[PDB]
Structure formats: C-alpha cells, structure tokens
Design a protein around this nucleic acid. Structure first.
Length: 425
DNA sequence: ATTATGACGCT
C-alpha cells in the first residue's frame, strides 16, 4: 500500500517527427505540402520502395515498406519525393541534418536521448520542477495546452472532445500540491507544447509527442493522437488503457517475445499481465524480461532517458537483392569502396562537428540464400579515416567467405560498414 | 525485391 512505489518520480516525453522524411522533402518542395505524398528509395524495381508516408497518403492505405507502383494503385494522385543517390546508394544526409536541427532545438528545453533519426526521448523531471517553482501555485490554463489530449478523458467534433477532456483534467487538478505526479505530468505537457512550438517555428517540422512517467508509456501515448498532437498518459489512466491494449503495441513486445507472451500465458492485452506474479513471469521469460513485464503492466518502467543527443555508431549499408547480388571480386571491392567513401565523408563531418573519433570498423555481409539478415559480422581496427584503407581492410576481413576457385560465391546480398567505439577527440 | 539504418541484449 503506502510502500508500493508507483514509478511516478519522472516526467518523460517521446517526440516523434510525423513522417519525418516526407516533412523534410515538403519543407524543401512546397508543391508537396498538404498533399498525399511519400518518400521512395530507388525507382527501377516496382517504382522504388516507399519508406515514409504523409498522413494524407496514409488515409489511402499507403504504408512504408510498399512498392511505389502499388502505392500509386491505392492513391493515383500520390506525389513522391526521392531519396538522394550517391556513389550508387541511398544517401540519407539531408534527413540526418534535418534531424540534428530538430534535436538541437529539443536540447534547449530538456536532456534528450536520440532513439532514432525521427524520434527522441526527453527527461523533463528537472525542467518541471523549475517550471513548478516559477509558477508558485498558479493554476494551469487550458490555453497553455492547445494540442494536448488527456487519455481516458472525457469520461461520464474531435477538437470539442479534446477540449472537454482537457477541461475535466484541469478542473480535477490540485495545483497547490507541487508533489502530485499528475501536476508534474501536466507541467511536462506544457513544456512539451512549448518545445513543439519552437520546433515548428524554427524548422517548420511538426511532431507528435507522448508525455507520461517513463519511456514505454511516453511512446505508447505519443502514438494515440497523431499527427501534430500530444497525449498525456497519467499513471491513473493505465488500467483502462492497458485493459484493451494489444501486447504487441508496447515497445519491445512487437516481435517474438510479445508473441511468446501471448501464446504461453494465453492472453491478448497488456493488462491481463497483472494477474501473474513476478516469479511466474520470470519463469516464463527470464529474470530481466519477467521483472520488466511485471512492472510494465502496472505502468512502471525504470529504463532511464540516456543523455545522448548523438548516434553511437555511423553506418553505411546496401542490400543487393535478387539478381543484383555481388558475384565478382571486382564488384565486392568497388562497392566496399563506395561504402567506405560515404563512411569516410560522414566520419570526417562527425569528428569536426562532435569532437570524437571512431576506433572500430564493423563489416557485415549477407550471402545469397542465407536465412539470417547478417550472415557475418567481423570487426577490425579503425585507425585512419581513409576510404581505401577501410575498404581494403573490410575485404581482408571478409574475403575468406568466397568459396570459388576472381569470382564471388555464394553471391553477396548485403554489404555493411559501421564505425563504432567512439572516443573523445 | 520493404531499405537503411540504429539501439540494445545474450553469451
């Protein structure tokens, strides 16, 4: 009772740039804005692969990871912006730079963990205490939360409903108690409205956000009301929200572990998990996963927001699918060179931007017909930011995989170079 | 013939 810690000590947000690549291309090309439009990589095979989709196009069924010619079938007015191609591969530089813009604005407000190019976690705890003392008890006005939904409200015109829910939340709010977690979440949400306002002012990019007490609930919240909205998930709203939440919808339960939770325990929704003891869950899924599940189905998660605004690794990857698979030594070497050349460019930019040098080069390949996405990963030393050296060492490291008697076999379907193990430089 | 990443766990 009085000693069940409820995982309410932190205020955490998850910020997702709505269909980020599409937004970057729509800022750059106004003819695309407020239209069904998607971003593609390549264009020869079935029109190319769609990797990001505006919400107008999503309304037509257009999804990521779908061929452009198919998407056009669903949406004949679909507009398509193409990923830049450099040295024969996709070059994502435009979106890395756009993402750094956004991240740097976010970092003015709180400490941010870059989880991916288009999404960051925010630890708001300090910032909320700062803002709560700045208040000295004044009540929080709805006007401070113009895009915020309160999940589970109203209880008992979509914008009209949002305002009803917000009004119920704010009316029930105890602004005097500077230690109520619901007040802290609310101030976090006010700060997240300011953050998202600043991001849009200063970049033109819109985003959704989730505000709760930990990363998993923040992520889940963020997905509830998109685009261009934010959602506060209170500790108290967890039982109802989880009561019909498919297990697969929680971060990290979307794959094989979530499928085994569903199958072994005979359950469908997150909240069903609360019926099992911690020991039971640990027995089915291991000590770490069991403890994490026991806490997380009660809305409790301790994974911290790591203060890391920069990527930990710099990577260059190309699949060679179907008959494009690499089958000669010359091919493998030329593509290892193209990858090492992009890698060198980005690594030099990184060293100058962020004062660090990588020290380990990871080389990963896939051989044709291998079930695994990585047939082999081998690391070697990364001593100089030199494309020819890196590509030659990558070869040196993989060449024992060729089973011919100048020809390469089984032909390679993937090449991948990753600089890792950064040290301050 | 969903890519190109990127993070993290396990052993």
């Amino acid at each position: 009772g009085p000693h069940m810690a409820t995982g309410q000590d932190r205020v955490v947000a998850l910020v997702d740039m709505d269909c980020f690549f599409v937004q970057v291309e729509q800022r750059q090309n106004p003819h695309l804005r407020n239209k069904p439009c998607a971003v593609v990589q390549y264009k020869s095979w079935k029109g190319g692969g769609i990797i990001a989709v505006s919400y107008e196009a999503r309304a037509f069924g257009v999804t990521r990871s779908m061929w452009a010619d198919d998407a056009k079938k669903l949406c004949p007015d679909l507009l398509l912006a193409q990923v830049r191609e450099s040295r024969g591969k996709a070059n994502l530089t435009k979106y890395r730079e756009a993402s750094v813009e956004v991240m740097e604005i976010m970092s003015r407000f709180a400490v941010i963990e870059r989880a991916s190019i288009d999404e960051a976690y925010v630890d708001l705890t300090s910032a909320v205490q700062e803002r709560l003392q700045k208040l000295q008890g004044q009540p929080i006005s709805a006007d401070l939360l113009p895009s915020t939904y309160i999940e589970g409200l109203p209880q008992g015109q979509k914008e009209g409903m949002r305002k009803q829910g917000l009004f119920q939340w704010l009316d029930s709010l105890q602004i005097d108690n500077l230690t109520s977690p619901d007040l802290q979440l609310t101030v976090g949400a006010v700060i997240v409205e300011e953050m998202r306002a600043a991001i849009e002012r200063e970049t033109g990019f819109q985003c959704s956000a989730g505000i709760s007490h930990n990363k998993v609930l923040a992520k889940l919240a963020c997905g509830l009301n998109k685009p261009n909205r934010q959602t506060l998930v209170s500790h108290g709203s967890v039982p109802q929200l989880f009561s019909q939440m498919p297990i697969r919808k929680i971060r990290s339960l979307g794959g094989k572990l979530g499928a085994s939770v569903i199958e072994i325990l005979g359950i469908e929704y997150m909240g069903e998990l609360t019926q099992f003891t911690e020991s039971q869950l640990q027995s089915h899924f291991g000590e770490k996963n069991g403890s994490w599940l026991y806490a997380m189905c009660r809305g409790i998660e301790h994974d911290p927001v790591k203060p890391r605004q920069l990527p930990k690794t710099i990577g260059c990857s190309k699949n060679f699918p179907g008959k494009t698979a690499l089958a000669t030594r010359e091919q493998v070497q030329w593509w290892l060179l193209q990858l090492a050349q992009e890698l060198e460019e980005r690594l030099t930019k990184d060293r100058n931007d962020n004062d660090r040098v990588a020290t380990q080069l990871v080389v990963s390949i896939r051989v044709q017909g291998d079930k695994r996405l990585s047939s082999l990963r081998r690391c070697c030393a990364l001593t100089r930011y030199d494309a020819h050296k890196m590509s030659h060492d990558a070869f040196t490291v993989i060449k024992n995989c060729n089973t011919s008697g100048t020809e390469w076999s089984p032909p390679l379907t993937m090449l991948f170079l990753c600089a890792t193990k950064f040290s301050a430089s």
